[PDB]
């Protein structure tokens, strides 16, 4: 029943302790409160009636903004994003390149506008302030954690830019983990446009802030001593649209290559596996068979662990965008395998994060440009930070599955 | 009758004098001739029979070039830009992204070719030479004004690149105004592909050269003393296509964001306005109500001033591309409001310009790269230059409405 | 019969000798073996039964990879690349921008992956090693020649990057020729997706390695004395996709401009030619009339030389991508002119190369960045290198036509 979930949380906590740089340096107030916040946050917005209402209210607001932004892409691509497409091409009428990718552009512009107005800084200051006061974490790493709820791993540390070059190894590691444990507002709307429940996306985003700090301070406790704009609103929107455009082009090119490469891998795996009497061997079977214990450990039923392992594994070995692309058909009525609603939630939560190996190179560029003499430390702690970010997503998925 | 137009011109001239840096330094020959040229140019090509024939001849030639360039986009997007699209999606068969944006690429390549051959330099030298000889303006600012008829605000000063770092504040201001009062050959073909009459676009482009110098020397008179390539034609075309591609991507991303943001603004304005008994409140109503006196002042009928104010205002607070995108449906048979032909002309002329706040940042980058130690002056005169560019477009619209 | 082909080869060899920097410095072993290899390679894979089987086996493998990569573009553009497109738009259902361009992205990612694994370096080391041992050419220029079979003119010298700044003028010229005589794996799959026979593309690619060295050492004999990575596989794929994206955008923008410009040229040529009683004058007629002797010289029948001259000429004055775009309809059942299978082969081989004037500027950037103090030599030998690359493609076409 609920025993598998509580054991799941214990195992995830245990792995982080075993991989800690110094277990005797672990601050029990910090890691105790961080888990308490992430757990209570899950209890609040997924179990308690009032918290569920606030979550649905924020989600519907997000859903309304997406529809508003869709007027922009409707102007550019016209009938190619209309209802007539489904009458002609059926299911293939949904053109991903025109339906999902342009949303990255609009939300990037919106976020840039909200930064110019000071709305974002206002929310981050409140959330980040409450974290450091309750966990004892430093000012800079707390703000970066709160910022990571809404923006990406490279944009989040920008709110504490002048503090990055001199922050401790534990601080830098937490900053990295904050970005790896979360996603971004732009891609969130993209995943929502692909069928992923917004309530799960918003929840996992907020739970990433304490969850990121949790496993960061578990695996890399503080052993040192920490310390302590566009001309107008229209320029802000333009700059945001430009950054979103570049992102949309990068994501699209990645999806063409990766999905194409996976198809190539499956073709080769069919021939190689055939030598051992398994010609039906594919990448999905390997990932599913290898991540099934992990899926089962976080609350996925025994008969659904293998399928759930495919998506979780693909997110790890590649990225969450590719995983969501393969998981999205399982959210429609034309799903090859009908999954339970709890399993759908667990997969949604466990995928909601930038935790992968390729994100290390991105951290080296974005976060590294803020502190060029610290690129060595980023590369050194890269793998451990990904593991920490993975544990945070898995913990959030276990918590979500518990109250569901 | 015509009294409202002549008063309109007087008011526009009056505002520039009131905002002048030194009214006693205003050269009457310069500002007198500049207005005389812009007025006579309007009289020539919009009223006098022969001038109307030369305008239609140049416009049809432009219209033929656009159709020739459309063979390129027809090859890439095939049936998505064919007549079958209108049979399937109806009005939504016109895909803006494939119909308008690729034209920016072709014309950028063409202009680059005409620069390599020396055709552009030949025309600019004649027009720019006649301006300085009649107005007394300096050599450099005159060529940049003439160049601005065909190319953008950042490409126009390139013909006088080595003179920019040492030109006077009045010269630099005129260069800025020349770009803000005009558009570019690429986007001109785009607006033409959206339904805007080419005759109006060409006319307003040529009237921008004396009009730009007019309000530049009115608001910033000269108080100082002025002074005084690709390997082959195929490389020129390739470089032009590359620049046009980058432009086409920027415009498209901007249109997705801005239109999407306007839709978001309208949603919020509906809720905010509802608090004051106006739930139907939108961005269009605010702009229309605030720019109606300005539209009425330049010759737009009282019962059409509010609608015309929406487009003029949107061009100012954002850019002319967004304004044209909302004005284009009013040029078809399926227009929500049937406007008079004179009103259509006034709006077309008043929108034909890069005069907006975001163009300042663009001037800081493009024009600023030509003179890095002058970026301070560009930022300082930015707002006044936009105002001057706005007055030039409004003057051209008043002149156009007069002879129509 | 076969006398026209052998004379064709002799003429091509003769031109290179006449344009040599020093005919008395020509190494007979080098240029003798290089021609022997290119000729025997053609004999092997186009005439001899076993060699034809190995060619078809490699081609079908290439054809399978393309289909695998098409799963990526099928996900992004959905029904716009499905069979329904041909039912609605007929022949115009084939959208080039979604059918061909995305293939550049996938193959660029694949090649980047094969480089990370060491597969490419392994094949290049074998082919490049056999060339230098048989021709006496230096180590660096041999590897660059072999690398050019699979990758582009700017990516090929990267395998011998630290040797480029100090290599002789003859070596540098050979490196340039190796890239101009060949194409790239990405665009190869593009041309294959346009209808060009893969067997011809693969054959011409392999024949480019000895053919490139052949005319390089003929026109520029050695008179001096020669001398002598991503964090993971997923990062390699991402970087490749990014480079392919940039390439796909450049090619698409070029095709819009160039084809559009050709349409504009044809319009002007119709008016200019009309003055001399030839209003039907077009760019195709000029190129066909001027390259017909060259087409006839390499084995194209007298009544097909003019049509074949259009494609060969267009490849020279522009690029092979534009030429292939105009030659592709001649490979379908709806061809305006039914050509013989041998003529189709000759045109396919003669077009398979980056040999054009615009590739010089590209060599100045790519190859020049590897040796900034050698950009002068690259620009100096630019034209001769293009001629050499042209002769290599023409030789390969003559050889192909001989055994066919
Ligand atoms: C489409 C899906 C198909 C399935 C593909 C699965 C392949 C698994 C990739 C793992 O490769 C490793 O990843 C590390 C992470 O980058 C690299 O470490 C590199 O970076 C580390 C830190 O960032 C350092 O510790 C190392 O020294 C450095 O080698 C390491 O070299 C590399 O072997
Ligand atoms: C989609 C449409 C929705 C409607 C939106 C309308 C909003 C109006 C924007 C105006 O904002 C101002 O614009 C100036 C122009 O850039 C800025 O001046 C900045 O730049 C000037 C000069 O370029 C300087 O004088 C100033 O010091 C400097 O603040 C200024 O800060 C900013 O407040
Ligand atoms: C769409 C198709 C329409 C048909 C168009 C056909 C036009 C033919 C273009 C030829 O122009 C020449 O090309 C050279 C090659 O770049 C240039 O040499 C330049 O570069 C050379 C070496 O790279 C140097 O030798 C020269 O000094 C230098 O002028 C040269 O200037 C230029 O006149
Ligand atoms: N705003 C964003 C969006 C995405 N990303 C990177 O792209 C991968 C796929 O979404 C993510 O996993 C992440 O590596 C990013 O760094 N910042
Ligand atoms: N050639 C061009 C075209 C456009 N622009 C800038 O983009 C805005 C929208 O067209 C314009 O208002 C202007 O700011 C530009 O600077 N140069
Ligand atoms: N990988 C590639 C692909 C293309 N190119 C350049 O682009 C032209 C058209 O394919 C080619 O003729 C060549 O100039 C390149 O340099 N490298
Ligand atoms: Na984040
Ligand atoms: Na201009
Ligand atoms: Na090559």
In the numeric block, which tokens belong to residue B373? 């130690």
Residue in this structure with the two tokens 């002007």, named with its chain if needed: C268
Strands (E), B162-293: none
Distance CA C333, CA B371 (A): 59
Q: How many CB atoms lie within 10 A of CB C374?
A: 17
- Looking at ligand 1, which residue's alpha carbon is closest to its atom 3? A317
Could you give the number of structural domains in chain A? Answer: 1
- If contacts are CB pairs under 8 Å, which of residues 99-118 in chain A contact chain B? 102, 105-106, 108-110, 113
State both tokens at C188. 């190869």
Q: How many CA atoms lie within 13 A of C356 on its CB side?
A: 26
Give binding residues of C for cytidine as ranges: 153, 320, 356, 359
DSSP 8-state assignment for residue A89? S
The answer to whether the beta carbons of residues C397 and C299 sit under 8 Å apart is yes
CB count, 10 Å around CB of B121?
16
Q: Are C263 and C134 contacting, i.e. CB atoms less than 8 angstroms apart?
A: no
Closest residue to C75, CB basis, from A93, A259, A358: A259
Q: Is B246 labelled as part of a ligand binding site?
A: no
Range of the domain at B154: 1-404
Give every CB contact of residue A121 below 8 A, 6+ residues apart in sequence: A115, A159
Centroid of chain to Cα B292:
20
User: Both tokens of residue C47?
Assistant: 């005439």
Cβ burial, residue C232 (10 Å; 0-12/13-18/19+): middle
Chain C nearest-CA residue for A101: C76
CA atoms within 13 A on the CB side of A388: 33
Distances in Å between the Cα of B206 and the Cα atoms of A362, B12, B151, C340 are 48, 19, 12, 55
C253–B105 C-beta distance less than 8 A: yes
Q: Does C272 touch chain B (CB under 8 A)?
A: no
* A229 Cβ inside 6 Å of ligand 2: no
Joined tokens for residue B201: 């676009």
A301 DSSP 8-state letter: -
How many Cβ pairs closer than 8 A exist between chain B and C? 116
Query: Which uninterrupted H or E stretch holds A339?
Result: none
Tokens matching residue B209: 């050269």
Q: What is the 3-class SS of chain A, one letter each residue?
A: CCHHHHHHHHHHHHHHHHCCCCHHHCCHHHHHHHHHHHHHHHHHHHCCHHHHHHHHHHHHHHHHHHHHHHHHHHHHHHHHHCCHHHHHCHHHHCCHHHHCHHHHHHHHHHHHHHHHHCHHHHHHHHHHHHHHHHHCCCHHHHHHHHHCCCCCCCCHHHHHHHHHHHCCHHHHHHHHHHHHCCCCHHHHHHHHHCCCCHHHHHHHHHHHHHHHHHHHHHHCCCCCCCCCCCCCHHHHHHHHHHHHHHHHHHHHHHHHHHHHHHHHHHHHHHHHHHCCCCCCCCHHHHHHHHHHHHHHHCCCCCCCHHHHHHHHHHHHHCCHHHHHHHHHHHHCCCCCCCCCHHHHHHHHHHHCCCCCCHHHHHHHHHHHHCCHHHHHHHHHCHHHHHHHHHHHHHHHHHHHHHCC
- Record the resolution, in angstroms: 2.6
Q: CA B338 to CA B329: how far, in whole Å? A: 10
Mark residue A205 as left, alpha or beta (left: phi above 0; alpha: psi -120 to 50; beta: remaining): alpha
| Structure tokens, B182 | 């005009």
Give the integer Cα–Cα distance in Å for A130 and A124.
10
Q: Is A301 left (phi over 0), alpha (psi -120 to 50) or beta?
A: beta
Joined together, the tokens standing for residue B227 give 């002074």
- What residues contact A228, with CB distance under 8 A and at least 6 apart? A138, A139, A140, A163
Give the 3-state secondary structure of residue B229.
coil
CA–CA separation, C392 vs B393, rounded Å? 58
Closest by alpha carbon to C352, among C216, C207, C243? C207
Task: Tell whether B90 is within 8 A of chain A (Cβ).
Answer: yes
The one-character DSSP state at C42 is: H
Instruction: Tell me B181's DSSP state.
Output: S
Kindly report the protein residue whose alpha carbon is nearest to atom 14 of ligand 5.
Answer: B359
In angstroms, what is the span from residue A213 Cα to ligand 4's centroid? 20
Q: Is C383 in the pocket of ligand 3 (CB under 6 A)?
A: yes
Measured in whole angstroms, the distance separating CA C190 from the mean position of its chain's CA atoms is 12
Interface of C with A in 232-251 (CB under 8 A): 232, 234-235, 237-238, 240-242, 244-245
Asked if C165 and C374 touch (Cβ cutoff 8 Å), the reply is yes
3-class DSSP state for residue A300?
A: coil
Nearest to C241 among A256, A262, A361 (CB): A256
B267: helix, coil or strand?
helix
Residue B140: which residues within 8 A CB-CB, separation 6 or more? B160, B163, B164, B167, B171, B175, B226, B228
* DSSP secondary structure, B44-99, as one string: HHHTSHHHHHHHHHHHHHHHHHHHHHHHHHHHHHGGGGSTHHHHHSGGGG--HHHH
Whether the CB-CB separation of B185 and B148 falls below 8 Å is answered with: no
Question: Is C177 in contact with C159 (CB distance < 8 Å)?
Answer: no
Neighbouring C-beta atoms of residue A59, cutoff 10 Å: 18
CB B100 within 8 A of CB B66: no
Distance separating alpha carbons of residues A247 and B227, to the nearest angstrom? 46
List all residues 6 or more positions away from A170 whose beta carbon is below 8 Å from its beta carbon: A216, A217, A220, A221, A222, A223, A224
CA distance A36 to A8: 16
- Rounded to an integer, what distance in angstroms lies between the CA atom of residue B182 and that of residue C297? 54
> C: neighbours with 3+ CB pairs under 8 Å?
A, B
Q: Do A260 and C106 touch (CB under 8 A)?
A: yes
Enumerate the residues of chain C whose CB falls inside 8 A of the CB of residue A255. 72, 75-76
State in Å: Cα B174 to ligand 2 middle: 21
Q: What is the CA radius of gyration of chain C?
A: 21
**In the 8-state DSSP scheme, what is residue A168?**
-
Q: What residues in A contact C242, CB-CB < 8 Å?
A: 250, 253
- The answer to whether residues C167 and C227 touch, using CB atoms and an 8 Å cutoff, is yes
Distance B236 CA to ligand 6 centre (A): 16
- Judge whether A25 and A220 are in contact, CB under 8 Å: no
Q: What is the DSSP string of B202-215?
A: HHHHHHHHHHHHHH
Length of chain B (residues): 404
A210's CB contacts (< 8 A; 6+ apart) are A34, A35, A37, A38, A41, A131, A135, A145
Residue ranges of the annotated binding site of A are 153, 155, 320, 356, 359
**Taking the CA atoms of chain B, what radius of gyration do you get in angstroms?**
21
Of all protein residues, the one whose alpha carbon is nearest to atom 29 of ligand 2 is A231
Interchain contact, C80 vs A96, CB within 8 Å:
no
| CB distance B202 to B62 below 8 Å | yes
Q: Give helix A233-274 / helix B358-369 axis angle, nearest 10°.
A: 80
Does residue C155 sit in helix, strand or coil? coil
For residues B161 and B184, is the Cβ–Cβ distance under 8 A? no
Distance CA B345, CA B330 (A): 12
Q: Tell me, what DSSP letter sits at residue C322? A: H
Spatial separation of the C-alpha atoms in residues B95 and B84, rounded to whole Å: 12
Q: For tokens 């003559």, what's the residue?
A: C398
What is the distance of C-alpha C276 from the center of its chain?
A: 37
Distance, in Å, from the CA atom of A272 to the CA atom of A285, rounded to the nearest integer, reads 14
Left, alpha or beta for B195 (phi > 0: left; psi -120 to 50: alpha)? left
Q: What are the Cα distances from residue C143, in Å, to A165, C123, C128, C160?
A: 44, 10, 4, 7
Helical ranges in A220-334 per DSSP H:
233-274, 283-297, 305-317, 320-327
Cβ(A232) to ligand 2 under 6 A? yes
- Give the determination technique: X-ray
Q: Is C187 in the pocket of ligand 6 (CB under 6 A)?
A: yes
Calpha distance A122→A120 (Å, rounded): 5
Number of H helices, E strands in chain C: 19, 0
For a mutational test of ligand 4's pocket, the pick from A105, A362, A385, i.e. the residue with the most ligand atoms closer than 8 A to its C-beta, is: A362
Candidate from B90, B97, B317 with C-beta closest to A76: B97
- Inter-chain CB proximity C261 and B237 less than 8 Å: yes
**Distance (Å, whole) CA C284 – CA C272:** 15
Q: Tell me the C-alpha distance between C54 and B369, whole Å.
A: 57
- Angle at which helix B341-351 crosses helix B305-317, to 10 degrees, equals 10
Distances (CA, A) of C18 to B225, C13, C125, C157, C217: 61, 9, 33, 28, 13
Chain C, nearest residue to A93 by Cα: C79
Q: What does the alpha-carbon distance between residue B304 and residue A111 come to, in Å, rounded to a whole number?
A: 37
Instruction: Scan for tokens 């102007």, then name that residue.
Output: A75
What gap in Å lies between CA B9 and CA B399, rounded to an integer?
8
Rounded to whole angstroms, the Cα distance separating A221 from A144 reads 17
| CA-to-CA separations, C249 to B188, B226, B359, C81, in angstroms, rounded | 23, 44, 26, 19
B154 φ/ψ angles, rounded to the nearest 5 degrees: -100, -20
Phi, psi dihedral angles at B225 (to 5 degrees): -115, 110
Residues annotated within the binding site of C are: 153, 155, 320, 356, 359
DSSP secondary structure, C343-380, as one string: HHHHHHHHH-S--STHHHHHHHHHHHHS-GGGHHHHHH
* Residues 6 or more apart whose Cβ sits within 8 Å of residue C371: C164, C165
3-state secondary structure of C154: coil
String of DSSP letters for C195-227: T--HHHHHHHHHHHHHHHHHHHHHHS---S---
Count other C-beta atoms under 10 Å from residue B268's C-beta: 12
- Of A204, A216, A227, nearest to A353 by C-alpha is A204
The four Cα atoms A312, A313, A315, A319 give a dihedral, to 10 degrees, of: 180
Closest listed residue to residue C182, CA positions, set C225, C138, C215, C223: C215
Q: Which tokens belong to B26? A: 């205003």
**Cα-based angle A228, A229, A233 (whole degrees, multiple of 5):** 130
Task: Give every CB contact of residue C297 below 8 A, 6+ residues apart in sequence.
Answer: C4, C7, C8, C11
């Amino acid at each position: 029943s609920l025993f598998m979930s509580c054991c799941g949380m214990a195992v995830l906590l245990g792995i982080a302790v075993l991989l800690s740089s110094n277990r005797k340096a672990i601050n029990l107030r910090t890691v105790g409160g961080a888990f308490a916040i992430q757990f209570s946050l899950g209890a609040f917005i997924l179990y308690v009636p009032w918290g569920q209402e606030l979550l649905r209210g924020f989600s519907d607001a997000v859903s309304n903004v997406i529809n508003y932004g869709n007027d922009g892409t409707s102007f550019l691509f016209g009938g190619l994003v209309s209802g007539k497409m489904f009458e002609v091409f059926g299911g293939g009428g949904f053109i991903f390149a025109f339906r999902v990718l342009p949303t990255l552009i609009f939300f990037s512009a919106l976020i840039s506008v909200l930064y110019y107005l000071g709305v974002m800084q206002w929310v981050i200051r409140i959330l980040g302030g409450g974290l450091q006061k309750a966990l004892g974490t430093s000012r800079a790493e707390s703000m970066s954690a709160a910022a990571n709820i809404f923006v990406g791993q490279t944009e989040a540390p920008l709110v504490v830019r002048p503090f990055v070059p001199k922050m401790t190894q534990s601080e830098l590691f937490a900053v990295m983990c904050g970005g790896l444990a979360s996603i971004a507002g732009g891609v969130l709307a993209g995943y929502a446009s692909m069928g992923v429940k917004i309530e799960y996306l918003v929840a996992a985003s907020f739970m990433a802030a304490p969850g990121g700090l949790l496993f960061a301070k578990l695996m890399m406790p503080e052993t040192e001593k920490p310390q302590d704009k566009p001309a107008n609103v229209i320029d802000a929107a333009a700059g945001g649209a430009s950054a979103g455009l570049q992102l949309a082009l990068n994501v699209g090119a990645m999806l063409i290559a990766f999905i194409g490469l996976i198809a190539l891998i499956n073709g080769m795996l069919g021939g190689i596996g055939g030598w051992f009497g398994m010609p039906e061997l594919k990448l999905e079977m390997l990932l599913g068979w290898l991540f099934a214990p992990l899926a089962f450990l976080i609350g996925v039923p025994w008969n659904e662990a293998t399928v759930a392992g495919e998506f979780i594994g693909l997110k790890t070995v590649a990225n969450e965008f590719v995983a969501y692309s393969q998981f999205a058909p399982y959210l429609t009525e034309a799903a090859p395998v009908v999954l339970s609603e709890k399993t759908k939630a667990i997969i949604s939560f466990a995928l909601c994060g930038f935790a992968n190996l390729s994100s290390i190179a991105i951290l080296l560029g974005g976060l590294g440009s803020l502190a060029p003499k610290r690129r060595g430390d980023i590369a050194r702690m890269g793998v451990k930070a990904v593991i920490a970010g993975t544990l945070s997503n898995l913990m959030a998925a276990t918590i979500a599955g518990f109250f569901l």
